[PDB]
Design a protein around this nucleic acid. Sequence first.
DNA 1: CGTGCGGATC
DNA 2: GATCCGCACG
Length: 65
Amino acid sequence: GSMADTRRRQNHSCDPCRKGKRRCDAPENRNEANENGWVSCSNCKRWNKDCTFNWLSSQRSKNSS
DNA sequence: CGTGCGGATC
DNA sequence: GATCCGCACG
Ligand SMILES: [Zn+2]
Ligand SMILES: [Zn+2]
């Protein structure tokens, strides 16, 4: 494996994370995090980006439609 | 205290 | 497209 597998699938990364190629804290519950008070993962944090899984929640699958 | 990059596999 | 992952510098 490797490495195969080696990657993918652990907690999902924020919009800016995927764009900067970085893993993160903001998990599948990042939204619920903001609900329980989140902030910014390590990425958006260093780059004061925009920790978000919303537009995402709609960009990925959502869909919508 | 930000800054980005190459990779693995579909 | 997505997720992981560090790192070396100023
Ligand atoms: Zn992130
Ligand atoms: Zn973030």
